[PDB]
């Protein structure tokens, strides 16, 4: 019960982490579509900054998600240890 409450909290947090990653990746997708439509008109500097901006947010979230994923996996092994 004590170890479960800590595990549940970790999983909920990890779910928010993945959501933010998906939210941020969607903005990258919109920016890639924007670039394709820009080239389609033929046969921009702020675009490079915006691409860089979101990438920073995504990889910071991935890093945090990797750390959180390992915390959850260790606690689950601990919960299984105390159960048996």
């Amino acid at each position, epitope marked *: 019960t004590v170890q479960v409450r800590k595990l549940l909290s970790g999983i909920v947090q990890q779910q928010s982490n993945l959501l933010r990653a998906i939210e941020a990746q969607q903005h990258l997708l919109k920016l890639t579509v924007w670039g394709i439509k820009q080239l389609q008109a033929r046969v921009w500097l702020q675009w490079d900054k915006e691409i*860089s901006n979101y*990438t*920073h947010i995504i*990889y*910071e979230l991935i*890093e*945090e998600s*990797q*750390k*959180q994923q*390992e*915390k959850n*996996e*260790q606690e689950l*092994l601990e919960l299984d240890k105390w159960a048996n």
Partner: antibody
Amino acid sequence: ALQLVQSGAEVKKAGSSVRVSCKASGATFSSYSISWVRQAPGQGPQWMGGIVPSSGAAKYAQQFQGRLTITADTSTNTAYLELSSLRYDDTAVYYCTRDRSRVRYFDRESGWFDPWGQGTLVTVSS
Amino acid sequence: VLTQPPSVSGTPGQRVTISCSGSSSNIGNNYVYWYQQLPGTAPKLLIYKNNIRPSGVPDRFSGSKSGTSASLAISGLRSEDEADYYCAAWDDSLSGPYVFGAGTKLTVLG
């Protein structure tokens, strides 16, 4: 969550085998790949080799190919370093560290090493 | 293989730039990684994947890259920053993957 505890800080004569372990604490290195990197006193770091514990894959630098052999045991979560035919210039601090790129482990544009082992002093002097 | 200046100074509060000269095979095609090594301790990751920062590292540290040469900017210097810094990149050359720099000694200079 993942930390790396190293052990085995010994001295060996020229032409001897040295085993150095890289034990993981706080997490499992399941989907990740631990690499070995040495650093000579005064000089900078140098990449030794790498292994994927879940797969069994191995990669070695051209300088160490043949003499160097590294293996990882998943049941105890420990990576091992072994050097045959020891030379004088091997005297260095040996580190273990994992690349944070799960997808396509080696060569795939990524050398993202975050958690590093404490280090082990390997001295080569007769 | 990566070229680094031996030492760069800086009085408390100044911004310090550490250069890292490289080839077209390593830097001018792939990511640049930076590491901080306090004497005795293991090299900790300071800047990864061209400018991106790990959790814990202060905003004052900033990595940049232009062409085949990369630079690490350390603004607002403190006594905690006095360490050895190493640039790293993945190399396509037959020398081997993952090439590190020589190292730069940073002094707070009292």
